Amino acid sequence: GKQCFVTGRKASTGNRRSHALNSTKRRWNANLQKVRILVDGKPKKVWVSARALKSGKVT
Amino acid sequence: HIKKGDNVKVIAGKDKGKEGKVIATLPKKDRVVVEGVNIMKKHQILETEAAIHVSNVQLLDPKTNEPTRVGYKFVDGKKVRIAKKSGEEI
Amino acid sequence: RDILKRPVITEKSSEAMAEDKYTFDVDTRVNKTQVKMAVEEIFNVKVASVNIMNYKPKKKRMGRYQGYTNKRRKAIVTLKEGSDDLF
Amino acid sequence: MKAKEIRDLTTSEIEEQIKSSKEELFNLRFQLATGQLEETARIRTVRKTIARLKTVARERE
RNA sequence: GAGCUGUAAGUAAGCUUUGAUCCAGAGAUUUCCGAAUGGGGAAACCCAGCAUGAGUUAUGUCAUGUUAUCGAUAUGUGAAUACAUAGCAUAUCAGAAGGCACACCCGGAGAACUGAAACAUCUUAGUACCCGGAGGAAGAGAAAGAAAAUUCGAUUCCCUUAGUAGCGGCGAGCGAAACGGGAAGAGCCCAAACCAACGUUGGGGUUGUAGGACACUCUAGUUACAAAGGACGACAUUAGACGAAUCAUCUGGAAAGAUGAAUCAAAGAAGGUAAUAAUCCUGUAGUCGAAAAUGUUGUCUCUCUUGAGUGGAUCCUGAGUACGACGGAGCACGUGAAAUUCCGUCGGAAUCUGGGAGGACCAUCUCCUAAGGCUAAAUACUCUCUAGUGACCGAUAGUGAACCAGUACCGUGAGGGAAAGGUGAAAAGCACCCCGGAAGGGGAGUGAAAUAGAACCUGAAACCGUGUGCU
RNA sequence: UGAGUAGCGAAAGACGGGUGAGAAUCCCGUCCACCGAUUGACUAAGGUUUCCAGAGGAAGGCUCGUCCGCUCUGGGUUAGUCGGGUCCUAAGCUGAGGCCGACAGGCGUAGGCGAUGGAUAACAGGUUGAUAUUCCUGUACCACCUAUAAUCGUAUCG
């Protein structure tokens, strides 16, 4: 139940392939980081992806 | 349809063409008891009367004393019963 | 109130009348303190002590269908004065 | 469709509950338990009066 | 408008023309458990606080209201730590919970048996199972479209294109779209440039034949989208009422059958009547009827409302967006010469001389204007309510269940799962006599029939007994 | 069909008198026989009316039955002190906030639930066909409420 607070990034699902084309299930996870950001109330620590931290966000 | 305490004529059965007086009414089973017809014997031993179907009796005309059908015409505010083949009120 | 339902007249209760003990059928969900205060206001009799017991439904079959009777609560009341005068 | 003759004041309604219920229906049941009661159709008659009495009482809130 | 207190007998005691019983609309009461919600618990139980009240000289005892959790709104709200902000105690909320038709729809996650006459790519199959969210329908929907004509113009569904073009250990196999013919068919609102207050709320503005701000002389309530609450009479449901026409004889227990004579029909559909009935009964064709509740509709109320084109100095038209690389998925299309579009990681543009597409890619032409949001109809399905039909079954059949069947019974449990219909038209269900302790039987009697006697319509075979002609 | 065949589940019965339509099998009495660290007396779990009285003999009883744990009709279980709750906690279970996790959910703090353990006021005798620390008789104990009082306003409760 972990997701990016700014954008909403979440893990996905797909296949892992081999040279013989055998397929098994795997997951692509988001590069979430535990960073303190500005909040209206207490400044709390939330999951924010590294892409969201680009373009300029508070910390 | 056929009220109790009336004068009827039997048109079908063992005792056909015999006038009688209605003494009981069973509308759940559609059975009418006529006085003097359909005698029964019960081992208890007594002789009494049995029930007959309402479809085997016709009302008697007050004037001709002949079988007839029934109709309604709303003479008054209430509803009254008349007789076909004539105009006399039953 | 109408806590009491019916009086009980049996062979064992007949010999219990000599000791001023009366048997009644009461409501299932009442305590003997409530039964104590119900006799005093209907017959105007001062009571001494009240006993009470519970029963279980009995499986009674008539014809082809089986079933159960009602659960019964029975109370025995002891009187120091007066008499209920059951007819 | 019955005889709804009960039209007296609300104070007398409570007077008609202890009479009809507390002392009449209760007495009629102990009479039958030992067994002295003919006219057993009266048990239903008293019960329906109590239903009518409390129905008009609720109509007046 | 005359009987009634259900199956269910039967005996009591009752009610009813001063309108019983019954049918329909509208109200009141509604124990306990169960999301269960004062606390606990082995559901249908136990144990409390607070505020009034009923009884006791007084405790004991009882009745009525309220007290769960989370969330959203006002107030009081030291901390550690100066102001504050976590925690907290109150007040309010038709706020949420759980079930439901194992039907229809949209998402997350997602097999194997099987086929390839073995098998791993492939297929089964994005199927079965599970979880989440709804709705009466859901989803999609107003061109960064289809194409190559001297063009069309939102989405959805049916026919055809067509088993074509294609994909494929090029094996097994998978498999389209545009055009064309039809059902149905309305389109609008926001961000920015600009204008005055204290970043906020109002006005302005919504686009490709390029639109708008800015300067220029400049006038249809659509409550299914397009802005949101209410008042005005006509049909339709939820009880019903009128409504034509037949008499004789024969057989028979009984006539509706047969022999003869009549009638009606906007009514010859059907069911019941002692047997096969247009004219015996309930009905049918036709017409009429509504206190009261609930739907649809249409004529006024009511609530909003700025209707047109030439000029383009300058400004605005959606950014970590489009796009690229790496690893995947989905398009009929298995990375392949793969365009078109989604996810994870990392880089990362331009601003009408702009940008995207026309199956790698470049140039020329043609079409269009992404990165914000809503929208009825044609379409799919049936647990239920009313009215109907069948070259569909007729008790080993038809639902597992025509009988009080998800019952008996079996298992710790999830779960599995039967057999059983028929007297007679009418109970008229054998008064009475004889054998016993009774069951049963022989007479008499009821009935057309009693070998129709309730283990009751007909009553085959296997099988079991008695007597006889020939051996 | 096997076939009136196998079997009828450890074991000692005999006689007299009654009931009765019907008795080796039912009642009453006598004698003999068997267990007696148990086939005797209580009670926990489990079963749920099989317990008592009066009637009955279709089916059940591996035979018969006048009998029964079987059928019909009526009856039977009484607590301030006994075991449990209004007392307490083991091992475990559930947990407001909180942590983790595609969904569903997993774990866990404060706090609760939970005896097989701890704490806690009664004995003797009699009585019915069926109840007995429960009913009755006699003698006790524990908690709580109400009105004068000995002694008490620094007491006293915590």
mmCIF file with all atom_site columns, C-alpha atoms (C1' of nucleotides) in Angstrom, chain E residues 180-353:
data_model
loop_
_atom_site.group_PDB
_atom_site.id
_atom_site.type_symbol
_atom_site.label_atom_id
_atom_site.label_alt_id
_atom_site.label_comp_id
_atom_site.label_asym_id
_atom_site.label_entity_id
_atom_site.label_seq_id
_atom_site.pdbx_PDB_ins_code
_atom_site.Cartn_x
_atom_site.Cartn_y
_atom_site.Cartn_z
_atom_site.occupancy
_atom_site.B_iso_or_equiv
_atom_site.pdbx_formal_charge
_atom_site.auth_seq_id
_atom_site.auth_comp_id
_atom_site.auth_asym_id
_atom_site.auth_atom_id
_atom_site.pdbx_PDB_model_num
ATOM 1   C "C1'" . G E 1 180 ? -21.099 0.430   -48.645 1.00 0.00 ? 180 G E "C1'" 1
ATOM 2   C "C1'" . G E 1 181 ? -26.477 -0.853  -46.650 1.00 0.00 ? 181 G E "C1'" 1
ATOM 3   C "C1'" . G E 1 182 ? -29.547 0.053   -41.812 1.00 0.00 ? 182 G E "C1'" 1
ATOM 4   C "C1'" . A E 1 183 ? -31.386 1.236   -36.110 1.00 0.00 ? 183 A E "C1'" 1
ATOM 5   C "C1'" . A E 1 184 ? -30.708 5.716   -33.351 1.00 0.00 ? 184 A E "C1'" 1
ATOM 6   C "C1'" . G E 1 185 ? -29.253 10.606  -33.540 1.00 0.00 ? 185 G E "C1'" 1
ATOM 7   C "C1'" . A E 1 186 ? -28.674 17.434  -29.527 1.00 0.00 ? 186 A E "C1'" 1
ATOM 8   C "C1'" . G E 1 187 ? -24.086 19.325  -28.104 1.00 0.00 ? 187 G E "C1'" 1
ATOM 9   C "C1'" . C E 1 188 ? -21.696 22.188  -24.459 1.00 0.00 ? 188 C E "C1'" 1
ATOM 10  C "C1'" . C E 1 189 ? -18.704 23.887  -20.016 1.00 0.00 ? 189 C E "C1'" 1
ATOM 11  C "C1'" . C E 1 190 ? -13.506 25.101  -17.929 1.00 0.00 ? 190 C E "C1'" 1
ATOM 12  C "C1'" . A E 1 191 ? -7.106  27.033  -17.502 1.00 0.00 ? 191 A E "C1'" 1
ATOM 13  C "C1'" . A E 1 192 ? -4.491  31.859  -20.142 1.00 0.00 ? 192 A E "C1'" 1
ATOM 14  C "C1'" . A E 1 193 ? -4.117  36.882  -22.278 1.00 0.00 ? 193 A E "C1'" 1
ATOM 15  C "C1'" . C E 1 194 ? -7.666  41.674  -19.930 1.00 0.00 ? 194 C E "C1'" 1
ATOM 16  C "C1'" . C E 1 195 ? -10.634 44.299  -16.200 1.00 0.00 ? 195 C E "C1'" 1
ATOM 17  C "C1'" . A E 1 196 ? -11.393 46.834  -9.711  1.00 0.00 ? 196 A E "C1'" 1
ATOM 18  C "C1'" . A E 1 197 ? -10.984 45.059  -4.533  1.00 0.00 ? 197 A E "C1'" 1
ATOM 19  C "C1'" . C E 1 198 ? -8.304  42.595  -0.639  1.00 0.00 ? 198 C E "C1'" 1
ATOM 20  C "C1'" . G E 1 199 ? -3.056  35.120  -3.724  1.00 0.00 ? 199 G E "C1'" 1
ATOM 21  C "C1'" . U E 1 200 ? -9.086  34.962  -3.137  1.00 0.00 ? 200 U E "C1'" 1
ATOM 22  C "C1'" . U E 1 201 ? -13.973 35.793  -5.049  1.00 0.00 ? 201 U E "C1'" 1
ATOM 23  C "C1'" . G E 1 202 ? -17.149 38.108  -9.582  1.00 0.00 ? 202 G E "C1'" 1
ATOM 24  C "C1'" . G E 1 203 ? -17.181 39.481  -15.396 1.00 0.00 ? 203 G E "C1'" 1
ATOM 25  C "C1'" . G E 1 204 ? -14.675 37.963  -20.335 1.00 0.00 ? 204 G E "C1'" 1
ATOM 26  C "C1'" . G E 1 205 ? -13.315 33.869  -23.107 1.00 0.00 ? 205 G E "C1'" 1
ATOM 27  C "C1'" . U E 1 206 ? -13.449 28.200  -25.663 1.00 0.00 ? 206 U E "C1'" 1
ATOM 28  C "C1'" . U E 1 207 ? -10.772 27.506  -31.639 1.00 0.00 ? 207 U E "C1'" 1
ATOM 29  C "C1'" . G E 1 208 ? -8.375  25.082  -37.589 1.00 0.00 ? 208 G E "C1'" 1
ATOM 30  C "C1'" . U E 1 209 ? -12.877 28.225  -43.754 1.00 0.00 ? 209 U E "C1'" 1
ATOM 31  C "C1'" . A E 1 210 ? -7.414  29.883  -37.063 1.00 0.00 ? 210 A E "C1'" 1
ATOM 32  C "C1'" . G E 1 211 ? -10.094 31.479  -32.571 1.00 0.00 ? 211 G E "C1'" 1
ATOM 33  C "C1'" . G E 1 212 ? -9.802  34.976  -28.787 1.00 0.00 ? 212 G E "C1'" 1
ATOM 34  C "C1'" . A E 1 213 ? -8.059  39.111  -25.435 1.00 0.00 ? 213 A E "C1'" 1
ATOM 35  C "C1'" . C E 1 214 ? -7.235  44.811  -27.427 1.00 0.00 ? 214 C E "C1'" 1
ATOM 36  C "C1'" . A E 1 215 ? -8.744  48.755  -30.342 1.00 0.00 ? 215 A E "C1'" 1
ATOM 37  C "C1'" . C E 1 216 ? -13.186 49.213  -33.710 1.00 0.00 ? 216 C E "C1'" 1
ATOM 38  C "C1'" . U E 1 217 ? -19.956 53.205  -35.415 1.00 0.00 ? 217 U E "C1'" 1
ATOM 39  C "C1'" . C E 1 218 ? -22.604 48.018  -33.403 1.00 0.00 ? 218 C E "C1'" 1
ATOM 40  C "C1'" . U E 1 219 ? -29.517 43.529  -30.294 1.00 0.00 ? 219 U E "C1'" 1
ATOM 41  C "C1'" . A E 1 220 ? -34.840 31.028  -26.843 1.00 0.00 ? 220 A E "C1'" 1
ATOM 42  C "C1'" . G E 1 221 ? -37.076 29.425  -18.574 1.00 0.00 ? 221 G E "C1'" 1
ATOM 43  C "C1'" . U E 1 222 ? -34.622 23.730  -22.160 1.00 0.00 ? 222 U E "C1'" 1
ATOM 44  C "C1'" . U E 1 223 ? -34.047 20.586  -14.256 1.00 0.00 ? 223 U E "C1'" 1
ATOM 45  C "C1'" . A E 1 224 ? -31.451 13.635  -19.538 1.00 0.00 ? 224 A E "C1'" 1
ATOM 46  C "C1'" . C E 1 225 ? -25.567 17.120  -20.240 1.00 0.00 ? 225 C E "C1'" 1
ATOM 47  C "C1'" . A E 1 226 ? -25.593 22.623  -21.400 1.00 0.00 ? 226 A E "C1'" 1
ATOM 48  C "C1'" . A E 1 227 ? -27.364 26.655  -13.532 1.00 0.00 ? 227 A E "C1'" 1
ATOM 49  C "C1'" . A E 1 228 ? -30.331 25.027  -9.599  1.00 0.00 ? 228 A E "C1'" 1
ATOM 50  C "C1'" . G E 1 229 ? -35.627 24.506  -5.200  1.00 0.00 ? 229 G E "C1'" 1
ATOM 51  C "C1'" . G E 1 230 ? -41.250 24.740  -6.225  1.00 0.00 ? 230 G E "C1'" 1
ATOM 52  C "C1'" . A E 1 231 ? -46.992 25.781  -7.885  1.00 0.00 ? 231 A E "C1'" 1
ATOM 53  C "C1'" . C E 1 232 ? -51.189 24.506  -12.715 1.00 0.00 ? 232 C E "C1'" 1
ATOM 54  C "C1'" . G E 1 233 ? -55.677 18.860  -15.467 1.00 0.00 ? 233 G E "C1'" 1
ATOM 55  C "C1'" . A E 1 234 ? -55.887 14.411  -18.627 1.00 0.00 ? 234 A E "C1'" 1
ATOM 56  C "C1'" . C E 1 235 ? -54.622 9.275   -19.231 1.00 0.00 ? 235 C E "C1'" 1
ATOM 57  C "C1'" . A E 1 236 ? -52.497 4.277   -16.468 1.00 0.00 ? 236 A E "C1'" 1
ATOM 58  C "C1'" . U E 1 237 ? -52.050 0.893   -12.362 1.00 0.00 ? 237 U E "C1'" 1
ATOM 59  C "C1'" . U E 1 238 ? -53.632 -0.967  -7.068  1.00 0.00 ? 238 U E "C1'" 1
ATOM 60  C "C1'" . A E 1 239 ? -60.982 -3.529  -5.485  1.00 0.00 ? 239 A E "C1'" 1
ATOM 61  C "C1'" . G E 1 240 ? -65.402 -4.382  -9.221  1.00 0.00 ? 240 G E "C1'" 1
ATOM 62  C "C1'" . A E 1 241 ? -70.629 -4.111  -11.971 1.00 0.00 ? 241 A E "C1'" 1
ATOM 63  C "C1'" . C E 1 242 ? -74.051 -5.051  -16.062 1.00 0.00 ? 242 C E "C1'" 1
ATOM 64  C "C1'" . G E 1 243 ? -73.843 -8.233  -20.024 1.00 0.00 ? 243 G E "C1'" 1
ATOM 65  C "C1'" . A E 1 244 ? -78.366 -12.904 -25.817 1.00 0.00 ? 244 A E "C1'" 1
ATOM 66  C "C1'" . A E 1 245 ? -80.331 -17.503 -26.548 1.00 0.00 ? 245 A E "C1'" 1
ATOM 67  C "C1'" . U E 1 246 ? -83.967 -24.968 -25.251 1.00 0.00 ? 246 U E "C1'" 1
ATOM 68  C "C1'" . C E 1 247 ? -87.816 -27.860 -24.587 1.00 0.00 ? 247 C E "C1'" 1
ATOM 69  C "C1'" . A E 1 248 ? -89.668 -33.124 -25.398 1.00 0.00 ? 248 A E "C1'" 1
ATOM 70  C "C1'" . U E 1 249 ? -88.860 -39.091 -25.942 1.00 0.00 ? 249 U E "C1'" 1
ATOM 71  C "C1'" . C E 1 250 ? -85.033 -43.816 -25.559 1.00 0.00 ? 250 C E "C1'" 1
ATOM 72  C "C1'" . U E 1 251 ? -80.929 -46.472 -22.792 1.00 0.00 ? 251 U E "C1'" 1
ATOM 73  C "C1'" . G E 1 252 ? -78.999 -45.669 -18.123 1.00 0.00 ? 252 G E "C1'" 1
ATOM 74  C "C1'" . G E 1 253 ? -77.591 -44.683 -11.062 1.00 0.00 ? 253 G E "C1'" 1
ATOM 75  C "C1'" . A E 1 254 ? -77.078 -40.112 -13.367 1.00 0.00 ? 254 A E "C1'" 1
ATOM 76  C "C1'" . A E 1 255 ? -77.775 -37.149 -20.129 1.00 0.00 ? 255 A E "C1'" 1
ATOM 77  C "C1'" . A E 1 256 ? -74.468 -32.846 -21.870 1.00 0.00 ? 256 A E "C1'" 1
ATOM 78  C "C1'" . G E 1 257 ? -75.312 -38.782 -26.031 1.00 0.00 ? 257 G E "C1'" 1
ATOM 79  C "C1'" . A E 1 258 ? -79.055 -40.463 -29.912 1.00 0.00 ? 258 A E "C1'" 1
ATOM 80  C "C1'" . U E 1 259 ? -84.059 -39.295 -32.335 1.00 0.00 ? 259 U E "C1'" 1
ATOM 81  C "C1'" . G E 1 260 ? -87.263 -34.402 -33.173 1.00 0.00 ? 260 G E "C1'" 1
ATOM 82  C "C1'" . A E 1 261 ? -88.554 -29.619 -33.214 1.00 0.00 ? 261 A E "C1'" 1
ATOM 83  C "C1'" . A E 1 262 ? -86.572 -23.897 -31.653 1.00 0.00 ? 262 A E "C1'" 1
ATOM 84  C "C1'" . U E 1 263 ? -83.268 -19.448 -30.425 1.00 0.00 ? 263 U E "C1'" 1
ATOM 85  C "C1'" . C E 1 264 ? -79.002 -16.213 -29.966 1.00 0.00 ? 264 C E "C1'" 1
ATOM 86  C "C1'" . A E 1 265 ? -74.374 -14.566 -31.914 1.00 0.00 ? 265 A E "C1'" 1
ATOM 87  C "C1'" . A E 1 266 ? -69.222 -7.606  -32.122 1.00 0.00 ? 266 A E "C1'" 1
ATOM 88  C "C1'" . A E 1 267 ? -70.594 -13.612 -27.411 1.00 0.00 ? 267 A E "C1'" 1
ATOM 89  C "C1'" . G E 1 268 ? -68.794 -21.196 -31.297 1.00 0.00 ? 268 G E "C1'" 1
ATOM 90  C "C1'" . A E 1 269 ? -62.026 -18.988 -25.983 1.00 0.00 ? 269 A E "C1'" 1
ATOM 91  C "C1'" . A E 1 270 ? -61.932 -21.985 -21.582 1.00 0.00 ? 270 A E "C1'" 1
ATOM 92  C "C1'" . G E 1 271 ? -63.368 -24.466 -16.901 1.00 0.00 ? 271 G E "C1'" 1
ATOM 93  C "C1'" . G E 1 272 ? -67.219 -27.095 -13.891 1.00 0.00 ? 272 G E "C1'" 1
ATOM 94  C "C1'" . U E 1 273 ? -71.653 -29.742 -13.845 1.00 0.00 ? 273 U E "C1'" 1
ATOM 95  C "C1'" . A E 1 274 ? -73.791 -37.927 -11.569 1.00 0.00 ? 274 A E "C1'" 1
ATOM 96  C "C1'" . A E 1 275 ? -71.400 -39.258 -19.283 1.00 0.00 ? 275 A E "C1'" 1
ATOM 97  C "C1'" . U E 1 276 ? -69.314 -35.747 -24.985 1.00 0.00 ? 276 U E "C1'" 1
ATOM 98  C "C1'" . A E 1 277 ? -73.457 -28.817 -23.600 1.00 0.00 ? 277 A E "C1'" 1
ATOM 99  C "C1'" . A E 1 278 ? -73.065 -21.848 -28.313 1.00 0.00 ? 278 A E "C1'" 1
ATOM 100 C "C1'" . U E 1 279 ? -78.637 -21.335 -25.226 1.00 0.00 ? 279 U E "C1'" 1
ATOM 101 C "C1'" . C E 1 280 ? -77.411 -25.154 -16.580 1.00 0.00 ? 280 C E "C1'" 1
ATOM 102 C "C1'" . C E 1 281 ? -73.305 -22.334 -13.532 1.00 0.00 ? 281 C E "C1'" 1
ATOM 103 C "C1'" . U E 1 282 ? -68.638 -19.353 -13.355 1.00 0.00 ? 282 U E "C1'" 1
ATOM 104 C "C1'" . G E 1 283 ? -67.384 -16.751 -17.826 1.00 0.00 ? 283 G E "C1'" 1
ATOM 105 C "C1'" . U E 1 284 ? -66.320 -14.668 -22.993 1.00 0.00 ? 284 U E "C1'" 1
ATOM 106 C "C1'" . A E 1 285 ? -67.493 -10.143 -27.138 1.00 0.00 ? 285 A E "C1'" 1
ATOM 107 C "C1'" . G E 1 286 ? -69.042 -4.907  -25.615 1.00 0.00 ? 286 G E "C1'" 1
ATOM 108 C "C1'" . U E 1 287 ? -69.653 -0.983  -22.050 1.00 0.00 ? 287 U E "C1'" 1
ATOM 109 C "C1'" . C E 1 288 ? -69.334 1.380   -17.379 1.00 0.00 ? 288 C E "C1'" 1
ATOM 110 C "C1'" . G E 1 289 ? -67.101 2.366   -12.507 1.00 0.00 ? 289 G E "C1'" 1
ATOM 111 C "C1'" . A E 1 290 ? -62.155 5.015   -8.082  1.00 0.00 ? 290 A E "C1'" 1
ATOM 112 C "C1'" . A E 1 291 ? -62.685 7.329   -1.522  1.00 0.00 ? 291 A E "C1'" 1
ATOM 113 C "C1'" . A E 1 292 ? -57.141 7.032   -1.377  1.00 0.00 ? 292 A E "C1'" 1
ATOM 114 C "C1'" . A E 1 293 ? -52.040 6.173   -2.879  1.00 0.00 ? 293 A E "C1'" 1
ATOM 115 C "C1'" . U E 1 294 ? -48.657 5.872   -6.797  1.00 0.00 ? 294 U E "C1'" 1
ATOM 116 C "C1'" . G E 1 295 ? -46.507 6.976   -12.350 1.00 0.00 ? 295 G E "C1'" 1
ATOM 117 C "C1'" . U E 1 296 ? -46.520 9.383   -17.150 1.00 0.00 ? 296 U E "C1'" 1
ATOM 118 C "C1'" . U E 1 297 ? -48.057 13.436  -19.927 1.00 0.00 ? 297 U E "C1'" 1
ATOM 119 C "C1'" . G E 1 298 ? -49.339 19.072  -21.590 1.00 0.00 ? 298 G E "C1'" 1
ATOM 120 C "C1'" . U E 1 299 ? -51.401 24.598  -20.879 1.00 0.00 ? 299 U E "C1'" 1
ATOM 121 C "C1'" . C E 1 300 ? -50.225 28.427  -17.878 1.00 0.00 ? 300 C E "C1'" 1
ATOM 122 C "C1'" . U E 1 301 ? -46.763 29.949  -13.260 1.00 0.00 ? 301 U E "C1'" 1
ATOM 123 C "C1'" . C E 1 302 ? -41.736 30.206  -11.430 1.00 0.00 ? 302 C E "C1'" 1
ATOM 124 C "C1'" . U E 1 303 ? -36.103 30.378  -11.897 1.00 0.00 ? 303 U E "C1'" 1
ATOM 125 C "C1'" . C E 1 304 ? -31.701 32.100  -15.771 1.00 0.00 ? 304 C E "C1'" 1
ATOM 126 C "C1'" . U E 1 305 ? -30.409 34.832  -20.085 1.00 0.00 ? 305 U E "C1'" 1
ATOM 127 C "C1'" . U E 1 306 ? -25.547 40.145  -24.665 1.00 0.00 ? 306 U E "C1'" 1
ATOM 128 C "C1'" . G E 1 307 ? -27.878 39.072  -30.312 1.00 0.00 ? 307 G E "C1'" 1
ATOM 129 C "C1'" . A E 1 308 ? -24.023 40.200  -35.170 1.00 0.00 ? 308 A E "C1'" 1
ATOM 130 C "C1'" . G E 1 309 ? -18.943 41.154  -39.274 1.00 0.00 ? 309 G E "C1'" 1
ATOM 131 C "C1'" . U E 1 310 ? -14.210 43.773  -41.559 1.00 0.00 ? 310 U E "C1'" 1
ATOM 132 C "C1'" . G E 1 311 ? -8.426  45.085  -38.829 1.00 0.00 ? 311 G E "C1'" 1
ATOM 133 C "C1'" . G E 1 312 ? -4.723  41.049  -36.786 1.00 0.00 ? 312 G E "C1'" 1
ATOM 134 C "C1'" . A E 1 313 ? 1.115   46.438  -33.406 1.00 0.00 ? 313 A E "C1'" 1
ATOM 135 C "C1'" . U E 1 314 ? 1.547   43.527  -29.067 1.00 0.00 ? 314 U E "C1'" 1
ATOM 136 C "C1'" . C E 1 315 ? -0.023  39.381  -25.842 1.00 0.00 ? 315 C E "C1'" 1
ATOM 137 C "C1'" . C E 1 316 ? -2.541  34.209  -24.683 1.00 0.00 ? 316 C E "C1'" 1
ATOM 138 C "C1'" . U E 1 317 ? -4.133  28.934  -26.490 1.00 0.00 ? 317 U E "C1'" 1
ATOM 139 C "C1'" . G E 1 318 ? -2.944  23.040  -20.935 1.00 0.00 ? 318 G E "C1'" 1
ATOM 140 C "C1'" . A E 1 319 ? 5.588   21.089  -19.108 1.00 0.00 ? 319 A E "C1'" 1
ATOM 141 C "C1'" . G E 1 320 ? 8.945   17.525  -16.171 1.00 0.00 ? 320 G E "C1'" 1
ATOM 142 C "C1'" . U E 1 321 ? 4.096   17.346  -20.995 1.00 0.00 ? 321 U E "C1'" 1
ATOM 143 C "C1'" . A E 1 322 ? 5.259   15.423  -26.094 1.00 0.00 ? 322 A E "C1'" 1
ATOM 144 C "C1'" . C E 1 323 ? 9.693   12.603  -27.459 1.00 0.00 ? 323 C E "C1'" 1
ATOM 145 C "C1'" . G E 1 324 ? 14.303  9.375   -27.075 1.00 0.00 ? 324 G E "C1'" 1
ATOM 146 C "C1'" . A E 1 325 ? 17.254  5.049   -24.757 1.00 0.00 ? 325 A E "C1'" 1
ATOM 147 C "C1'" . C E 1 326 ? 16.780  0.380   -21.548 1.00 0.00 ? 326 C E "C1'" 1
ATOM 148 C "C1'" . G E 1 327 ? 13.275  -3.782  -19.809 1.00 0.00 ? 327 G E "C1'" 1
ATOM 149 C "C1'" . G E 1 328 ? 7.913   -5.228  -20.619 1.00 0.00 ? 328 G E "C1'" 1
ATOM 150 C "C1'" . A E 1 329 ? 2.508   -5.016  -22.263 1.00 0.00 ? 329 A E "C1'" 1
ATOM 151 C "C1'" . G E 1 330 ? -1.314  -4.235  -25.680 1.00 0.00 ? 330 G E "C1'" 1
ATOM 152 C "C1'" . C E 1 331 ? -2.768  -3.372  -31.152 1.00 0.00 ? 331 C E "C1'" 1
ATOM 153 C "C1'" . A E 1 332 ? -5.476  -9.632  -35.772 1.00 0.00 ? 332 A E "C1'" 1
ATOM 154 C "C1'" . C E 1 333 ? 0.167   -8.280  -36.133 1.00 0.00 ? 333 C E "C1'" 1
ATOM 155 C "C1'" . G E 1 334 ? 5.247   -13.836 -31.754 1.00 0.00 ? 334 G E "C1'" 1
ATOM 156 C "C1'" . U E 1 335 ? 10.675  -6.879  -31.971 1.00 0.00 ? 335 U E "C1'" 1
ATOM 157 C "C1'" . G E 1 336 ? 10.313  -8.257  -36.951 1.00 0.00 ? 336 G E "C1'" 1
ATOM 158 C "C1'" . A E 1 337 ? 11.692  -3.282  -42.187 1.00 0.00 ? 337 A E "C1'" 1
ATOM 159 C "C1'" . A E 1 338 ? 6.696   -2.104  -36.701 1.00 0.00 ? 338 A E "C1'" 1
ATOM 160 C "C1'" . A E 1 339 ? 4.209   3.071   -37.707 1.00 0.00 ? 339 A E "C1'" 1
ATOM 161 C "C1'" . U E 1 340 ? -0.054  3.927   -34.199 1.00 0.00 ? 340 U E "C1'" 1
ATOM 162 C "C1'" . U E 1 341 ? -0.381  3.726   -27.553 1.00 0.00 ? 341 U E "C1'" 1
ATOM 163 C "C1'" . C E 1 342 ? 0.390   2.356   -22.024 1.00 0.00 ? 342 C E "C1'" 1
ATOM 164 C "C1'" . C E 1 343 ? 3.462   1.286   -17.566 1.00 0.00 ? 343 C E "C1'" 1
ATOM 165 C "C1'" . G E 1 344 ? 8.716   1.442   -14.503 1.00 0.00 ? 344 G E "C1'" 1
ATOM 166 C "C1'" . U E 1 345 ? 14.009  3.973   -14.708 1.00 0.00 ? 345 U E "C1'" 1
ATOM 167 C "C1'" . C E 1 346 ? 16.985  7.851   -16.794 1.00 0.00 ? 346 C E "C1'" 1
ATOM 168 C "C1'" . G E 1 347 ? 17.550  12.181  -20.112 1.00 0.00 ? 347 G E "C1'" 1
ATOM 169 C "C1'" . G E 1 348 ? 14.471  15.907  -22.076 1.00 0.00 ? 348 G E "C1'" 1
ATOM 170 C "C1'" . A E 1 349 ? 11.707  20.196  -26.758 1.00 0.00 ? 349 A E "C1'" 1
ATOM 171 C "C1'" . A E 1 350 ? 9.008   24.438  -29.781 1.00 0.00 ? 350 A E "C1'" 1
ATOM 172 C "C1'" . U E 1 351 ? 5.412   28.412  -29.066 1.00 0.00 ? 351 U E "C1'" 1
ATOM 173 C "C1'" . C E 1 352 ? 1.071   29.808  -35.478 1.00 0.00 ? 352 C E "C1'" 1
ATOM 174 C "C1'" . U E 1 353 ? 7.372   30.971  -40.019 1.00 0.00 ? 353 U E "C1'" 1
#
